[PDB]
Design a protein around this ligand. Structure first.
Ligand SMILES: [Zn+2]
Ligand SMILES: [Zn+2]
Lengths: 75, 46, 276, 111, 90, 76, 134, 57, 285, 55
């Protein structure tokens, strides 16, 4: 599905840009900001956002904080 | 809030409570729980 | 007026920096030539940027190094897409035969190159910065083309205007108080000029000079009635509040400076009269 | 301490009601509110008699924690808003939130 | 209030101090006998502007003189100390 | 032949290798003497990035014809 | 400020449910107009007493204060209430910012006057600028 | 200093005094400046007497 | 003139001496000042705004004087970067190799001094990759500085928003307000104090083209717009003085300089107020 | 009112003699004065430190 790949790439780019903008955030705040940014083109799905967050964590774009697992930091 | 000064949609939770997206966004910046059931808030559906 | 020209507050900065760099390198002011580039939206010639140009002096004439122009053009075309050749700039006095000689070479690149003269030593009626265009005269025989001066506008975007506003608000071996007072002087001079012009108009319309307008005279009367500005007792208390606040700050700063000076004096006294 | 159980929604009603009652007695209204909400949810999912008693307690706990947010705004509590045994409580909330002493005292005196 | 509505004057009413504060008022009719008042007021404004400019120039000159004196004293002290350092290396 | 490699900041390094010398030995010698990773260096001659084509034959190198050493520049 | 005399015709064309009172004898129209008059008077007054505020609003002395305090605590208008003096204060100007505003207005007046002079006698303005520059 | 108040013994009323931050800041700064000037003018004299190596034997 | 005509006179003897001494190899906290020219600042701002929300970057030209990095010019690399990442794969390197030679031809004697880079909407700081690139550039080109400019924040706030940073070398072992403004690598680099300078002719034409904002200055009325900034400077200066007296048992000189600057700006505001009162309030009685 | 003021819920004080409640619509930007007080205290401490070094 071309639209699924386009949405996944848009969500990953939005997450990376937001994480650079804040340099630290919470899970709910990150999801809210991603939704508010990507609502222009489509309605995001929370499962896809979480999958993109996980795949960016694996790609060493962002990391989970040692103190709290619900906090993300840009690296 | 958009009524007094301006896309407004619904934002459901894991409890399926369906608050306004902007209202729950404003609520979440102060409290981490759902307004109704007072449980930990997790986003679902939009 | 033939073609209209739009100018940005970057070309002038580039030309001034080039001139000062060459003056510092050679120890004395020298003549510099550069290339003006920008957009050609039909009737408007928008000069956006500029780069230094290589020129060689032979006897007394100047020849533009064309190969350097082509290399720099191919170099900058991959950074500024919608920016092509527009003309050339030179710092100096009036348009002299050397300038027209250089234009005779520049004109083989584009149909009508611009010329932008920057004169820092202007004490006459003409504006220090000026824009010229080559005009092919219809005189029979050996027709020497003329150089016609064209006016320029002050079009500026909001962002760049805000940027230059910020760079002008900030200050800084010139004394800081001298610079601040000169900045105030520049604005009081403009206010004085406007008020003097209005006063001269009123004086002229008084007896016989200019046919007076009732509306303008009434507005001038209102302007005169607008003074003094806020001569109330409440203002005269807040003003002295501000004066005393700044005076206390000045007293504390003076105490700090004297503390530093006495620290230095004590240090030197201890390292000279060191007694154990 | 049990976090790996799948019990009937009557056991989770009884224990959650007990927790809400003990939180109310101790003074932790914030915990009593969520405990009573969970108990009422479980009782409404399965049951009937002990249903419009945890709703009253949930209303009281919500009113005891500086109020805000109507308890009868969720899916579960909304149908029972007009219940004869809950009409007094929903009127008490409607007077408490959007505060007015006259309506609150009138509802108290009438009931 | 009804005069404020017509926009001839703009201002506010202070009941506590029993005052009317006027920010702006239109210029009423000026006859051909009080134009000299306009000339005098504008001349006084120009004189004040000239005096302020002269004072600013005088203060700029004084500040520049003070800065140049401080720099000259600093450089003279520097020259003297390096001279004493040179003659002390015998 | 004597190359006069130079960085854009003005640092100049002079190197003397043979006009016909195997590239591998010089590469190993520079990475063993100065330890310069090849992953970030870029060698530019006459404004062209050098590739693995023929060397010292088409180019008329004469006394270090300004070989530019550029480091990797990435950001974001 | 809207007096009631110009609202008698408006009250006739209102639909019946819009003509209902608020359990105190005053209908919807002559409560919205009361709030509008009070808000508009907040702009014409630095402060006003309760008696005078009720004199121009036809509300006698007390419901004037009640409505004034109700328009506050909601952000609908700015100001505070000194009940001891019986005075509502709307907006206070802090002298120096007022001085700034008046100086700016004076400069704008100067600029407008010069523009009018230039557009009235352009030749005289040009010759005067030339003489001034010298 | 436990209670910032003033007793009025005529009408027997305990009023609360309000410290004027501006006035107290000004007076504290002026007193500090006076103390600084006195200390510095004493230190200058001490430097003068130590440079002369003046002491009581 | 003369003294203010300096900084534009470029000499090679001093540059060679400071480049051969390499005093930064011992003191890692060497450079503390970044003196950027007006032309470089303007070119940086326009280039950063030209890319919109896509990241763009370029080089710098300049020199070193003592413990100060002087920036006199800016580049414009032909880089096509994404909305959050710029690469400079193969065209930027050849472009910057050719531009230096082309500038040598016309008379630009300044060499490369660092790189500037745009952060479209995420402040001014060095990320992990920025820190890595800057530390590599410092390890192999010792005099270097990394400048980051935010175009969108500059346009929104109406003020120039850029910073200059230098990384610590790897292995440099030696509170909570430095983790949101900067990245997780905030301890791997330090921020140079950034100051701007212009020339005599530039200020001449700037004051010459200053003919529409006299009303703004005649009613600017500082000490009210910069009251919060002034009290911030004052309560930072109190802590600076506390540190200086703790050192006493030169920090005191720096604290005195900061106090002098704050006091001088306050007296400048008071002078503006006095001039305005003389201009507008002492006329017509 | 006493209970609410003691709880920092109401910013005001009570006139017992006049039976009044005076609210706290006050406390403008006086951080400048606290900053100046800190400056004065640091200056006094630096005075005592510098003057008493040796002489
Ligand atoms: Zn909304
Ligand atoms: Zn919920």
């Amino acid at each position: 599905s071309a639209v699924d790949e386009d949405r996944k790439m848009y969500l990953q780019a939005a997450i990376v840009r937001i994480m650079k903008a804040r340099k630290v955030l919470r899970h709910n705040a990150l999801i809210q900001e991603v939704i508010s940014q990507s609502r222009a083109r489509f309605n995001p799905s929370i499962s896809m956002i979480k999958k993109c967050i996980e795949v960016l964590i694996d790609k060493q774009y962002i990391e989970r904080s040692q103190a709290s697992a619900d906090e993300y930091s840009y690296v | 809030e958009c009524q007094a000064n301006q896309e407004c949609t619904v934002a459901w939770g894991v409890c399926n409570h369906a608050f306004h997206f902007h209202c729950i966004s404003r609520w979440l910046k102060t409290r981490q729980v759902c307004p109704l059931d007072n449980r930990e808030w997790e986003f679902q559906k939009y | 007026g033939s073609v209209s020209v739009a100018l940005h507050p970057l070309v002038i900065l580039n030309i001034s920096d080039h001139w000062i760099r060459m003056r510092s390198q050679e120890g004395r002011p020298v003549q510099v030539i550069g290339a003006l580039i920008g957009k050609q939206e039909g009737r408007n010639i928008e000069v956006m940027n500029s780069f230094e140009l290589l020129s060689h002096t032979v006897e007394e004439k100047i020849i533009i190094d064309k190969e350097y122009y082509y290399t720099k053009e191919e170099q900058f075309k991959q950074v500024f897409k919608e920016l092509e050749f527009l003309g050339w700039y030179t710092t100096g006095g009036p348009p002299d035969p050397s300038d027209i000689h250089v234009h005779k070479q520049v004109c083989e690149i584009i149909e009508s190159p611009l010329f932008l003269k920057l004169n820092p030593m202007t004490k006459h009626t003409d504006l220090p910065v000026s824009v010229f265009e080559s005009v092919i005269d219809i005189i029979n025989g050996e027709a020497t083309m003329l150089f016609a001066e064209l006016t320029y506008t002050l079009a500026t975007e909001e962002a760049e205007r805000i940027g230059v506003d910020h760079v002008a608000r900030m200050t800084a071996e010139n004394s800081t108080v001298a610079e601040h007072l000169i900045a105030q002087h520049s604005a009081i001079k403009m206010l004085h000029s406007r008020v003097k012009l209005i006063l001269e108009y009123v004086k002229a319309s008084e007896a016989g000079e200019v046919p007076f307008n009732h509306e303008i005279l009434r507005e001038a009367y209102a302007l005169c009635h607008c003074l003094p500005v806020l001569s109330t007792d409440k203002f005269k208390t807040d003003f002295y509040d501000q004066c005393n606040d700044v005076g206390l700050m000045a007293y504390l700063g003076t105490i700090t400076k004297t503390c530093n000076t006495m620290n230095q004096f004590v240090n030197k006294f201890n390292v000279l009269y060191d007694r154990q | 301490h049990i976090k790996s159980a799948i019990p009937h929604p009557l056991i989770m009603g009884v224990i959650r009601e007990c927790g809400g009652k003990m939180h109310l007695r101790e003074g932790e209204f914030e915990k009593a509110h969520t405990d009573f909400f969970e108990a009422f949810k479980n009782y409404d999912e399965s049951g009937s008699p002990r249903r419009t008693t945890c709703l009253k307690y949930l209303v009281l706990a919500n009113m005891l924690m500086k109020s805000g947010i109507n308890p009868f705004d969720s899916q579960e509590a909304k149908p029972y808003k007009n219940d004869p045994e809950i009409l007094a409580m929903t009127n008490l909330v409607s007077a408490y939130q959007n505060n007015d002493i006259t309506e609150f005292e009138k509802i108290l005196k009438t009931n | 209030i009804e005069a404020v509505y017509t926009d001839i004057i703009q201002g506010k009413l202070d009941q506590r101090n029993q005052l009317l504060e006027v920010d702006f008022c239109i210029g009423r009719d000026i006859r051909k006998k009080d134009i000299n008042n306009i000339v005098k007021t504008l001349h006084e404004w120009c004189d004040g502007c000239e005096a302020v400019l002269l004072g600013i120039e005088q203060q700029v000159l004084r500040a520049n003189q003070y800065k140049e004196n401080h720099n000259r004293t600093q450089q003279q002290v520097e020259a003297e100390v390096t001279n004493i350092k040179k003659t002390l290396k015998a | 032949m004597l190359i006069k490699v130079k960085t854009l900041t003005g640092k100049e390094i002079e190197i003397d290798i043979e006009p016909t010398d195997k590239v591998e030995r010089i590469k190993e010698r520079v990475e063993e003497k100065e330890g310069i990773p090849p992953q970030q260096q870029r060698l530019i001659y006459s404004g062209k990035q050098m590739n693995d084509e023929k060397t010292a034959a088409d180019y008329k190198i004469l006394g270090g014809s300004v070989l530019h050493l550029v480091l990797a520049l990435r950001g974001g | 400020i809207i007096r009631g005399n110009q609202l008698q015709e408006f009250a006739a064309m209102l639909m019946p449910h819009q003509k209902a009172t608020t359990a105190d004898g005053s209908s919807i129209l002559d409560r919205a107009v009361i709030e509008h008059n009070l808000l508009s008077a907040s702009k014409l007054y630095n402060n006003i007493t309760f008696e005078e505020l009720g004199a121009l609003l036809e509300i006698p002395a007390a419901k004037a204060e009640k409505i004034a305090s109700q328009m506050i605590t909601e952000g609908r208008m700015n100001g505070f209430i000194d009940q001891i003096d019986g005075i509502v204060h709307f907006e206070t100007r802090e002298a120096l910012p007022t001085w700034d505003k008046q100086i700016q207005s004076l400069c704008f007046q100067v600029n407008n006057l010069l523009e009018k002079i230039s557009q009235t006698a352009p030749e005289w303005t040009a010759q005067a600028m030339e003489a001034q520059m010298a | 200093g436990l209670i910032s108040a003033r007793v009025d013994s005529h009408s027997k009323i305990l009023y609360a005094r309000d410290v004027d931050q501006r006035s107290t800041t000004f007076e504290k700064s002026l007193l500090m400046g006076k103390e600084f000037q006195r200390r510095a003018k004493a230190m200058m004299l001490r430097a003068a007497v130590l440079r002369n190596q003046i002491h009581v034997k | 003139a003369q003294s203010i005509d300096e900084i534009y006179k470029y000499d090679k003897k001093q540059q060679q001496e400071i480049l051969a001494a390499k005093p930064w190899t011992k003191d890692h906290h060497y450079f503390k000042y970044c003196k950027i020219s007006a032309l470089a600042l303007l070119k940086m701002v326009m280039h950063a705004r030209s890319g919109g929300n896509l990241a763009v970057m370029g080089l710098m030209l300049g020199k070193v004087d003592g413990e100060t990095m002087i920036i006199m010019d800016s580049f414009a690399l032909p880089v096509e970067g994404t909305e959050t990442r710029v690469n400079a794969q193969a065209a930027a390197y050849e472009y910057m190799a050719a531009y230096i030679e082309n500038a040598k031809q016309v008379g630009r004697l300044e060499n490369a001094i660092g790189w500037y880079h745009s952060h479209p909407g995420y402040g001014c700081w060095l990320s992990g990759i920025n820190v890595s690139t800057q530390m590599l550039n410092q390890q192999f080109q010792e005099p270097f500085v990394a400048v980051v400019i935010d175009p969108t924040r500059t346009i929104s706030a109406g003020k120039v928003n850029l910073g200059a940073f230098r990384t610590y070398p790897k292995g440099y072992k030696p509170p909570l307000n430095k983790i949101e403004d900067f990245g997780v690598h905030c301890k791997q680099y330090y921020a140079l104090e950034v100051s701007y300078f212009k020339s005599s002719l530039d200020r001449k034409l700037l004051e010459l083209l200053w003919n529409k904002y006299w009303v703004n200055t005649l009613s600017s009325s500082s000490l009210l717009t910069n009251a919060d900034y002034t009290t911030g400077q004052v309560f930072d200066l109190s802590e600076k003085l506390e540190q200086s007296e703790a050192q006493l048992g030169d920090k005191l000189a720096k604290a005195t300089r900061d106090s002098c600057k704050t006091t001088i700006e306050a007296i400048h505001g008071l002078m503006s107020q006095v001039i305005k009162d003389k201009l507008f309030n002492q006329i017509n009685i | 009112l006493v209970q609410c003021i003691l709880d920092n819920t109401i910013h005001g004080r009570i006139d017992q003699v006049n039976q009044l409640l005076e609210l706290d619509h006050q406390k403008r930007g006086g951080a400048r004065y606290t900053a100046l007080d800190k400056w004065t205290n640091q200056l006094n401490s630096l005075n005592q430190a510098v003057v008493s070094k040796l002489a």
